[PDB]
Amino acid sequence: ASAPIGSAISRNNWAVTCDSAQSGNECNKAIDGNKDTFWHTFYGANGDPKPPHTYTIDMKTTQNVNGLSMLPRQDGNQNGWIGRHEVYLSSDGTNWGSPVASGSWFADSTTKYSNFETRPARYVRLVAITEANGQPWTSIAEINVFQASSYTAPQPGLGRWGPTIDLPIVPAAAAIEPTSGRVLMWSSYRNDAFGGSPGGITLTSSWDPSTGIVSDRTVTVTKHDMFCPGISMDGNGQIVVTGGNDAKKTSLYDSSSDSWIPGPDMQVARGYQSSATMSDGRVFTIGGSGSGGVFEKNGEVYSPSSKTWTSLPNAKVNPMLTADKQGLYRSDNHAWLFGWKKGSVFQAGPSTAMNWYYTSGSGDVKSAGKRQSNRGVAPDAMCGNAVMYDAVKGKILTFGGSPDYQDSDATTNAHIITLGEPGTSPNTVFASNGLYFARTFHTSVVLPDGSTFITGGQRRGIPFEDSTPVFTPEIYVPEQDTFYKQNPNSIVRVYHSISLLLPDGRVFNGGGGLCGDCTTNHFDAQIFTPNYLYNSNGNLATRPKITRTSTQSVKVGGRITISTDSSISKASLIRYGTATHTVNTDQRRIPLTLTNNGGNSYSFQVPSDSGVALPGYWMLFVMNSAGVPSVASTIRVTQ
Ligand SMILES: [Cu+2]
């Protein structure tokens, strides 16, 4: 089940309009209060008109609308379940504009929801594009519109939230498909739960940013239930998904062919582990006692060329453990791993002790000191994030988290870690005065300008509960060493939530829940459009365009020559991310040093060290004098 974000509006003076309505199944039979009666479109004697079908509401007066609900027919018949839909709002009743919520709903008889940002309106409209099984009809038992307590206009220069993307599943895990631009999402064996899994099945869903179509799929070929995994993009351009409910399995996703290929089994059975792509294109993973048993799980490496998993027992998991109250079951989870120089992997936390991991031979480990500052020694920060915003200078920003996984208070702790050569202890200082709001179970992404977008979370970590939420997002600008509060949202994004950077420069934020009978399931996602895409008037600014590229595939140390339509100031390369349970080891940014050739032609060099410039797919963004970025050009880096 799910829950709305507002309170129900009285339907006593409502006037409804429909495109088609049968005798006995009228248009007003959706607002009467009876769970057994329903509105239904023309069938039988009146013919069978195909979708789009529309339902328009007139609330007589202006209300502060923040969502709607749709209860299907409860008579056991499938005829009329709404699949693809669109929600519109208006003040006049003729000019509707752009949709506040669009997407697809699951094929069942449960109550469906569309939760969006507060916007004052008198007229509400629900358009049913398709039927769940592809039939000509549309039916609704009960339709309600919800309102917020008050409305406050969004502050200029602090971004905008919206629109909402309705999904058939709860996206607990996600990744961007580089070659197509789509957002691949997955849950478990079911759309709303994970417990009591038979194994061998994962339900996936994808969203296209250009078309707006949401299409679901069922993956059984890999014999893996991909809930609670370790995700990494290898050097061969394939997404390596490891463990979880089927603790020993590995699944590979190829973006070019849009298919799932079976991978070889791991040496050790894991769950809730973090995996990281190395300098040679290989994938390293360590720990993970979330599933497959509770014991000492040391490191292991995946080779994409030979299709094998090899154990590295001397790469000890013992110095990276937290002092969690639940023991080893939670202490080796969600490691802040980063692929670095000469096959090494840096562990920034969540534990107080930071370590260097080596992959040559049977593996090795060395102490990198404690995560600290002049404010003292930093405690254990489970489910806190770690983002590499400047890979050239080895800059990592760590923030949030709590001492224990569950039933523990979060802190405002924030640090800057500067990486050098493997084996040396890095310099650690405090990032400004810390976060504005203490948060755990939060997610983050690196933006084109070097800034880090932080959103969601809760003050006290209690899984499957939406208690003490943080609605206000934060942005960290490194040049000024300052945190900035952005415009707040209305949907709670706690445990099982994700955040990914879209090729168009915007942020995809969704998920939260996945507990079955709970009312905390979020079958949606929201889009955040940052300040850099807006001008002085508050409208969408003109974005510069990359007209030509010399090559789409480059090697480490090689040069690329581009051509633009206007003058640019800065340029950056961002690696495509993957997200689940606050972990994102794939994302990183490289600031580019440009050479002006003249006539809007620029040249740059991709770093020679493959530990800085990790092999895989990257996003090319160029910024003008106003700071407005372009859309991303997909560049593949090899070694
Ligand atoms: Cu989980």
Ligand code: NA
């Ligand atoms: Na009814």
